[PDB]
Design a protein around this motif. Sequence first.
Motif, PDB file in Angstrom:
ATOM      1  N   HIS A  29       0.802  -1.214   0.000  1.00 42.61           N
ATOM      2  CA  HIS A  29       0.000   0.000   0.000  1.00 42.61           C
ATOM      3  C   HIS A  29       0.836   1.265   0.000  1.00 42.61           C
ATOM      4  CE1 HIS A  29      -3.082  -2.933   1.134  1.00 42.61           C
ATOM      5  NE2 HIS A  29      -3.924  -2.062   0.602  1.00 42.61           N
ATOM      6  N   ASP A  51      -3.587  -2.332  -6.976  1.00 39.31           N
ATOM      7  CA  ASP A  51      -4.245  -3.155  -5.957  1.00 39.31           C
ATOM      8  C   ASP A  51      -5.527  -3.659  -6.575  1.00 39.31           C
ATOM      9  OD1 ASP A  51      -5.375  -4.268  -3.638  1.00 39.31           O
ATOM     10  OD2 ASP A  51      -5.273  -2.418  -2.466  1.00 39.31           O
ATOM     11  N   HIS A  53     -11.645  -4.039  -2.006  1.00 39.31           N
ATOM     12  CA  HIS A  53     -11.715  -2.757  -1.302  1.00 39.31           C
ATOM     13  C   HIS A  53     -11.059  -1.567  -2.034  1.00 39.31           C
ATOM     14  CE1 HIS A  53      -7.828  -4.150   0.732  1.00 39.31           C
ATOM     15  NE2 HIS A  53      -7.495  -3.036   0.099  1.00 39.31           N
TER      16      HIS A  53
HETATM   17 FE   LIG Z   1      -5.562  -2.582  -0.620  1.00 42.16          FE
END
Ligand SMILES: [Fe+3]
Length: 214
Positions: free
Chosen positions: A80, A171, A175
Amino acid sequence: KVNAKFELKPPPYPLNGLEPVMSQQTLEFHWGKHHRTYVENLKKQVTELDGKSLEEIIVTAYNKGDILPAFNNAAQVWNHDFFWECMKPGGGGKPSGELLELIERDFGSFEKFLDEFKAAAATQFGSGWAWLAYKASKLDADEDNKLVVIKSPNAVNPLVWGGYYPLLTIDVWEHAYYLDFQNRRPDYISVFMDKLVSWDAVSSRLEQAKALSA
Ligand SMILES: [Fe+3]
């Protein structure tokens, strides 16, 4: 780097910096909740690991794939951090300079690379990541020292392989996109490349990658 009183690193832009393509809401959850949580839990687990670097914890805990408890948390913090660095307000378009040349050298064209990267991102089943990485044995048959597209499950990143230097990630955990795109992961990936990706960031990594594998 190290895990002292390590704190969550903010993205290099305000949480509304990526509107309207990635919502402030997405940032607030993805960074402020998910990413924050990985950081907090990693700190609780981290010990003989205390004061080690994030990357060192990641490579050790991977344990040839028989992962140790800190792996998921450490790898996701790093992933992240890297993910936020991969984007910018007014991103998108095409790379230039040595990055573009190498991409053309290894994929034929930027468009071919884009399609390959998007297909990797789209076909990673479940949670995970897609990567552009520089493959170089000097990092750890002559091909070798070249760009590759790779998809990885869950928290896994090219640091655990290795001989790979991560240059770009998206990613593809739900989410990352669900608030903005719901099921439409291909649209998300497309918009990421068209509007969000920071080629400046990717180019910087490529210079580091070349320097390290010389
Ligand atoms: Fe993530």
